[PDB]
Amino acid sequence: IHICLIKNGMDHMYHSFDVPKCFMGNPITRDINWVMFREFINSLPGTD
């Protein structure tokens, strides 16, 4: 994924990647919504 982003000119965005605010419980407090992580990964549309 990193090298694909390097080719696509998105190095800065990759190094700016962080835990999404929707996943992260609150910006101030380090809390993780693990349930929604499982929901997202179970809903990940893999190619064949």
Swiss-Prot record:
Subcellular location, in the record's words?
Host Golgi apparatus; Host endoplasmic reticulum; Host endoplasmic reticulum-Golgi intermediate compartment; Virion
Q: Which cysteines are joined by disulfide bonds?
A: none
Superkingdom as given in the UniProt entry: Viruses
Protein's job: RNA-dependent RNA polymerase, which is responsible for the replication and transcription of the viral RNA genome using antigenomic RNA as an intermediate. During transcription, synthesizes subgenomic RNAs and assures their capping by a cap-snatching mechanism, which involves the endonuclease activity cleaving the host capped pre-mRNAs. These short capped RNAs are then used as primers for viral transcription. The 3'-end of subgenomic mRNAs molecules are not polyadenylated. During replication, the polymerase binds the 5' and 3' vRNA extremities at distinct sites.
**Assembly and interaction partners:** Homomultimer. Interacts with the glycoprotein N; this interaction allows efficient polymerase packaging into virus particles. Interacts with nucleoprotein N.
Other information:
Classified as His(+) endonuclease since it has a histidine upstream of the active site that coordinates the first cation.
Q: Family, per the entry?
A: Belongs to the Bunyavirales RNA polymerase family.
Report the domain remarks.
The N-terminus contains the endonuclease activity (endoN). The central region contains the RdRp activity. The C-terminus contains the cap-binding region.
Give the protein name, as stated in the record. Answer: RNA-directed RNA polymerase L
Gene encoding this polypeptide? L
